[PDB]
Design an enzyme around this catalytic site. Structure first.
Site, PDB file in Angstrom:
ATOM      1  N   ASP A 243       9.347 -23.163 -40.705  1.00  0.00           N
ATOM      2  CA  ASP A 243       9.982 -22.452 -41.343  1.00  0.00           C
ATOM      3  C   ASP A 243      11.702 -22.615 -41.080  1.00  0.00           C
ATOM      4  O   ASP A 243      12.281 -22.251 -40.165  1.00  0.00           O
ATOM      5  CB  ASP A 243       9.810 -20.861 -40.993  1.00  0.00           C
ATOM      6  CG  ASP A 243      10.342 -19.661 -42.193  1.00  0.00           C
ATOM      7  OD1 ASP A 243      11.480 -20.155 -42.477  1.00  0.00           O
ATOM      8  OD2 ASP A 243      10.087 -18.542 -42.077  1.00  0.00           O
ATOM      9  N   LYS A 272      17.736 -18.997 -48.077  1.00  0.00           N
ATOM     10  CA  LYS A 272      19.016 -18.589 -47.553  1.00  0.00           C
ATOM     11  C   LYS A 272      19.947 -19.422 -48.250  1.00  0.00           C
ATOM     12  O   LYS A 272      20.856 -18.728 -49.113  1.00  0.00           O
ATOM     13  CB  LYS A 272      19.045 -18.435 -46.041  1.00  0.00           C
ATOM     14  CG  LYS A 272      17.956 -17.343 -45.478  1.00  0.00           C
ATOM     15  CD  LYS A 272      18.522 -16.821 -44.287  1.00  0.00           C
ATOM     16  CE  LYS A 272      18.076 -15.483 -43.948  1.00  0.00           C
ATOM     17  NZ  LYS A 272      16.667 -15.444 -43.214  1.00  0.00           N
TER      18      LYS A 272
HETATM   19  C1  LIG Z   1      15.644 -14.720 -43.598  1.00  0.00           C
HETATM   20  C2  LIG Z   1      14.263 -15.527 -43.233  1.00  0.00           C
HETATM   21  C3  LIG Z   1      12.855 -15.093 -44.057  1.00  0.00           C
HETATM   22  C4  LIG Z   1      12.731 -14.011 -45.222  1.00  0.00           C
HETATM   23  O1  LIG Z   1      13.522 -14.590 -46.324  1.00  0.00           O
HETATM   24  P1  LIG Z   1      13.993 -13.435 -47.215  1.00  0.00           P
HETATM   25  O2  LIG Z   1      14.761 -14.446 -48.381  1.00  0.00           O
HETATM   26  O3  LIG Z   1      14.807 -12.582 -46.441  1.00  0.00           O
HETATM   27  O4  LIG Z   1      12.484 -12.897 -47.961  1.00  0.00           O
HETATM   28  C5  LIG Z   1      11.886 -15.923 -43.384  1.00  0.00           C
HETATM   29  N1  LIG Z   1      11.944 -16.960 -42.538  1.00  0.00           N
HETATM   30  C6  LIG Z   1      12.879 -16.945 -41.727  1.00  0.00           C
HETATM   31  C7  LIG Z   1      12.949 -17.972 -40.731  1.00  0.00           C
HETATM   32  C8  LIG Z   1      14.416 -16.279 -42.347  1.00  0.00           C
HETATM   33  O5  LIG Z   1      15.408 -16.827 -41.713  1.00  0.00           O
END
Ligand SMILES: *Cc1c(COP(=O)(O)O)cnc(C)c1O
Ligand SMILES: *Cc1c(COP(=O)(O)O)cnc(C)c1O
Ligand SMILES: NC(=O)c1ccc(-c2ccccn2)s1
Lengths: 422, 420
Positions: A243, A272
């Site tokens: 992730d 993001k």
């Molecule tokens: C922000 C984030 C998410 C979720 O993303 P959203 O756009 O807020 O749904 C998932 N995994 C990680 C590592 C993140 O930083």
């Protein structure tokens, strides 16, 4: 048309916010964003402050950037959106190529979507379907370690930190490993493998944030751990999934934190900062092998299709952003932000309330001994011309990559006083 | 730059598509570039030809693409503020849209939680239900009850209330009633109640698409069912959730489908047609009561990154306001009427099994699966983009379509249906 005193009344009354409760805590009105600066109305007056969080990780090139703005309007002049069902288009194909090539090698397919959260479920979906294609319905659980965060959807929450989303008997039950050390102890990998070992046959995947754990608590760990996970997964036929929804696109100091150990996952999630903070967009990437196993297995497809899949506006602007990162020497500068935060934050280590200072790329952290009170910290930071949002015991920044050296002084310095403020 | 055949080359190797594969066509995706008005310019003979869209690029483009008002609202906002984090900050677009959504939605839906897509807004809606009953100290209430035929998104919580047939058992086991029938049957509703009854002390919420079931069979059913359900939920103390991600914003003839039954739900979802088709943006609305019960359990634990994205919202305000500054009901009526006539000749065709029209929604339901490799090139030859699904030949045109364009789409449809 609404004044700030109207936004404020309309807001309290009708809007939820993140981890919010209609009727408690206190947001502040924003009326402009440009480069690294916001205009917040405080006490009837507009004031200048640095977006020290890059609007929660997204404005890597800051707000209102000429290249990114133009990528938008010009796309808007040609085509705003078409269903990606039976249709394809230039921004989807350029972003994809761009994504396929700049990523951990072997990741050459691309599933587009709209949020990080969904980007995560899709990865799960690939993992699950993958082994179902391989005649192993047995593999459907998800091993991770503690302190991780992967979004607020019910499967993503499932591999979010259990003893600290938030603790739910409604989420799936997943294999959690204890909390991964900052420094490289070879025994933690040992324990991790041994845990995965009792669970191998029922583990479709292992999901991890590479090198830096973001919303879990701004925690770093030694890049050699990801090497260990790669092998462990490789020897046990467990998919490995990164992730990189927070880490991605230069944030930690390399292009993706994955590259700090030169490892490639089977599946990768990014969001993001993918669009440079302009629009919601996500992508999920998997190796050709994983894709050829989905298609060819029963159902013969990955059953997932968001309405706004591969949205031309989102892609177009993202092409700019990605190109913008790659077309400058991003490495030298992230390093210099790292230099700047490190120098500017070192004074905080001598404060009584400060437990730790850590920097990693354009990521500056001050861990305290108490939870930080937003009622005191937020004004404080604002008083010093900086937008700061503490969380838990952490006072941290994640500045836009275009902050000047002096702009990174303001930020470190404002962070310091906040810490001193206990 | 990048030519269609490069786009196709790259697409073939590197792109996922909706519920598609990597490697297996047997229909190569058709290149779009550009797309505007009610028309998309498509490349398929290596040549640019405009076709009516039809649908609305999947319910998205209700005012057309490149609509001046909506291009300008985006133009405007982009210039002063593209996005800020909604953690600790509020902005004008959010407020203006929240005010607009709170006022046009069925009465009682008083707060808005923005998210990024239909699927997230659904999961958010369930979070509202389940956090709701825990604050009433009734934590066993944590399943969902729904119609067969339904569709509510692709994330795994949303998948657990989807019609168990299309759209592997690792999802949440939820309570499925039988398919909601087209015409009003008092017997169906009562049988729904008897069932809900026995699981009600463990049901947090009923979840359905009001009047029109979109992606799960393009089905219409009689609105008094919803009003039965509103009652059924009132009496057994289960919340009602309507999924208006498809039906929202005039698409079925009323501003929202729930308005046909004349009933509000407790929690409510919209999106898709929210931004006027420009940008991914969803919304979940719940009542002050759900809201207040939530904040006394301690808050609604969800927060997407691009929550209340100032660009998605400013365009959405443009679109909603635009929708409302015109006699939209008449406009849709004419769409229903001009469509009704259009697809009439179909019902005699041997293939066709049914012809129905609800608001700006027209469907020819068929005997056999529709072999899109015959169909897609065929409708394209009639200057329409048309994408059937299983045994359905349907459309959802832009409200800006004209009686001429409408006949052009409905013609093409009938012909694809004759083509078996
Ligand atoms: C922000 C984030 C998410 C979720 O993303 P959203 O756009 O807020 O749904 C998932 N995994 C990680 C590592 C993140 O930083
Ligand atoms: C399209 C749709 C959704 C989900 O939309 P996505 O944004 O694609 O997840 C949910 N419910 C209904 C009724 C829909 O029509
Ligand atoms: N984004 C898209 O093009 C689509 C999303 C969902 C689509 C769909 C969903 C169900 C049946 C037929 N198409 S198409």
């Amino acid at each position: 048309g609404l004044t700030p005193e109207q936004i404020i009344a309309v807001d309290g009354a009708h809007l939820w916010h993140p981890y919010s409760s209609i009727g408690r805590e206190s947001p502040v009105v924003a009326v402009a964003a440009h480069g690294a600066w916001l205009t917040l109305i405080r006490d009837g007056q507009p004031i200048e402050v640095l977006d020290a969080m890059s609007s929660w990780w997204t404005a890597i090139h800051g707000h209102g950037h000429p290249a990114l703005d133009q990528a938008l309007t010009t796309q808007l002049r040609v085509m705003n959106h078409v269903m990606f069902g039976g249709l394809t288009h230039e921004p989807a194909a350029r972003l994809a190529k761009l994504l396929v090539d700049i990523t951990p090698a072997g990741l050459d397919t691309v599933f587009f979507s709209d949020s990080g959260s969904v980007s995560v479920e899709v990865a799960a979906k690939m993992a699950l379907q993958y082994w179902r294609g391989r005649g192993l319905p047995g593999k459907r659980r998800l091993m991770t370690w503690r302190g991780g965060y992967h979004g607020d959807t019910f499967l993503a929450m499932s591999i979010c930190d259990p003893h600290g989303h938030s603790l739910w008997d409604v989420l799936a039950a997943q294999v959690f490993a204890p909390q991964v050390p900052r420094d490289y102890d070879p025994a933690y990998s040992a324990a991790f493998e041994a845990q995965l070992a009792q669970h191998a046959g029922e583990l479709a995947a292992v999901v991890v944030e590479p090198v830096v754990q973001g919303a879990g608590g701004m925690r770093f760990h030694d890049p050699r751990y990801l090497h260990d996970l790669r092998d462990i997964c490789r020897r046990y036929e467990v998919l490995l999934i990164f992730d990189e929804i927070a880490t991605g696109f230069g944030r930690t100091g390399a292009l993706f934190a994955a590259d700090h150990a030169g490892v490639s996952p089977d599946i990768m999630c990014v969001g993001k900062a993918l669009t440079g903070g302009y629009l919601s967009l996500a992508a999920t990437l998997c190796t050709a092998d994983v894709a050829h196993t989905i298609s060819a297995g029963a159902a013969g497809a990955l059953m997932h299709g968001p309405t706004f899949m591969a949205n031309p506006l989102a892609c177009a602007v993202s092409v700019a952003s990605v190109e913008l990162l790659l077309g400058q020497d991003w490495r030298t500068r992230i390093t210099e932000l790292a230099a700047g935060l490190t120098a500017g934050l070192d004074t905080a280590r001598a404060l009584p309330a400060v437990t730790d200072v850590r920097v990693c790329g354009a990521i500056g952290v001050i861990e305290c001994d108490r939870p930080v009170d937003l009622a005191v910290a937020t004004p404080a930071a604002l008083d010093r011309g900086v937008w700061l949002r503490p969380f838990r015991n952490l006072v941290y920044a994640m500045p836009p990559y275009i902050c000047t050296p002096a702009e990174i002084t303001q930020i470190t310095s404002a962070m310091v006083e906040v810490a001193r403020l206990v």
